[PDB]
Design an enzyme around this catalytic site. Sequence first.
Site, short mmCIF file in Angstrom:
data_model
loop_
_atom_site.label_atom_id
_atom_site.label_comp_id
_atom_site.label_asym_id
_atom_site.label_seq_id
_atom_site.Cartn_x
_atom_site.Cartn_y
_atom_site.Cartn_z
N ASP A 82 0.86 -1.18 0.00
CA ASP A 82 0.00 0.00 0.00
C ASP A 82 0.90 1.23 0.00
O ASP A 82 0.60 2.24 -0.65
CB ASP A 82 -0.92 0.00 1.22
CG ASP A 82 -1.82 -1.23 1.28
OD1 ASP A 82 -2.21 -1.74 0.20
OD2 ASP A 82 -2.12 -1.70 2.40
N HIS A 100 -5.18 -3.83 5.45
CA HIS A 100 -4.83 -4.19 4.08
C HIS A 100 -6.04 -4.78 3.33
O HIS A 100 -6.13 -6.00 3.10
CB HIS A 100 -3.63 -5.16 4.12
CG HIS A 100 -3.10 -5.53 2.78
ND1 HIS A 100 -2.56 -4.61 1.91
CD2 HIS A 100 -3.00 -6.73 2.17
CE1 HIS A 100 -2.17 -5.22 0.81
NE2 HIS A 100 -2.42 -6.51 0.94
#
Lengths: 313, 312
Positions: free
Chosen positions: B151, B178
């Site tokens: 990310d 996530h």
Amino acid sequence: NAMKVAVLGAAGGIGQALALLLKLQLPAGTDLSLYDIAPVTPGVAVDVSHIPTAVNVKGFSGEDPTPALEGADVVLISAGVARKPGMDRSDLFNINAGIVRGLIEKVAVTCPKACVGIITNPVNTTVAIAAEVLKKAGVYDKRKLFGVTTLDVLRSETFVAELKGLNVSRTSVPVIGGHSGVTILPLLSQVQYAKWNEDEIEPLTKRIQNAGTEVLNAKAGGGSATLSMAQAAARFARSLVKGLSGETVVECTYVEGDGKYARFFSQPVRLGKEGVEEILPIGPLSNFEQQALENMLPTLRADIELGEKFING
Amino acid sequence: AMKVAVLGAAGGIGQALALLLKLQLPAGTDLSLYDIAPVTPGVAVDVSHIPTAVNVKGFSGEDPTPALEGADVVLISAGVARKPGMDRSDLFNINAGIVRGLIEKVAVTCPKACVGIITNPVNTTVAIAAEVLKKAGVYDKRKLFGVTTLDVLRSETFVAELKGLNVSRTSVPVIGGHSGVTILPLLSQVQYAKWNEDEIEPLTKRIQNAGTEVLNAKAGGGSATLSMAQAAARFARSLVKGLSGETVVECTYVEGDGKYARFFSQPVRLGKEGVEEILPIGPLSNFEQQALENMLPTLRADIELGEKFING
Ligand SMILES: [Cl-]
Ligand SMILES: [Cl-]
Ligand SMILES: [Cl-]
Ligand SMILES: [Cl-]
């Protein structure tokens, strides 16, 4: 000078790993173009495009590599099948000859002045195929065709360093000849800081020549040498890019030189703005190496002739 | 002599990760590769031919214990990946069991190792790992991490492109978890970037749905594997550096004070014991505060699902 590197065969095992390494290792501002028949390819590019480096990545799929080849300065060909448990060099040529031919036909009309690095095996033969396809298209420049043999160098550096207690990162081992079996000739006598006993030369030389088998016959089942082959290709591409950019680099690579040994032969080559700048001599050889050199020639010439015949009939 | 183990080394992420670690780990580091697939010893022989001072060995079969001997860091990427149309949570039924099995072995073979969970759904599988570790009586909160580093890579990349920043030197904190709605890039903390009213939400949604964008672009060929390997390699390098005594900060999913959720991703100073100090998220903009409120119920459910898989 914004370089463009195209990878034909970017969906295969070697291809994807190579895409990753090029994304991480290419100079800032370089364009990386990925192609393969499989529809996963654009997705491989998007995957790779998320890595934060200043390399622009685009992916292409389908039957036509022309879009992917637009403005390419370096074309790396890793398409086809790799050697896997229960496959001879005959299986490779059987599947890969037609693949290489079709790809080079597109290179010939789309980016004929690109330096082409053939990774797809058997290199000894597939490079001859490429040369003849380029000739038929009337654009063959022998300064721009390369058989990527760098994996023999990686393996040589690794084993020599292991066996002789040298720095694996800073050990240099020249490798001449071809890319398979007895044609792979590591010049162990030219390695610095290594004192050889007679009994070490042949076993190490055979180990380097047969290194692919250690991967295929690994315990539990084995596999193909996908990852090391990708790094070898990435290292070669890096050197080509440097040469095209004006930096002085020398690499052992399979090129059409003086024909003293065979039409195509791997020896040290200084790379430059036009691909091959100068094909350097092999340097002094030991009796073992001189003998090994003479021994390989009929095999190498046969490998070459097989590729020439594939196109010329 | 540090040792890094990869459980799931034959998969897409795994093989690419084996390659990157061989090339990126410090000289003298041991790399251990394991996967149920019999190709794994071959993957290690393959990687061993690359000339770097990282020693590599591969293992297969049903028992990962030999691969985990003396591991300081353990990266778990085993399991199956998404298919087009799925969210990370739909992988639970297959991956929950794979993560449990692997952690039972980590618990008895190398309980002091820093464990980085890559296998999805990370929000949940990290909770699974914690409870398995607790039943073995060796759970150390400082050593269990959900790897969210992809990310961060995505954020760094998209922010640098959009705002004309150096892609190699732009820092973007990312908090939460996530998964689609739990990924929260703190765009307001990025330096040298004047944000237009209309730029924040589309860029946040792009970072959040990046995994889906790769999934769709691969047309059934799986999810992200190559960028994920680099993200996992960067995280491993940070852990090794922390273990070695260097100071490093990474956004990572860990069990903190429970203010937001039991497990929450935020900047963490890494050290000799893994987590050295869980740092605060810093100042948030009105948009980020609201995005944080909106994710919490989903994040808490993701965790509870993992807890209930082991406890009940
Ligand atoms: Cl990175
Ligand atoms: Cl060959
Ligand atoms: Cl790398
Ligand atoms: Cl290398």
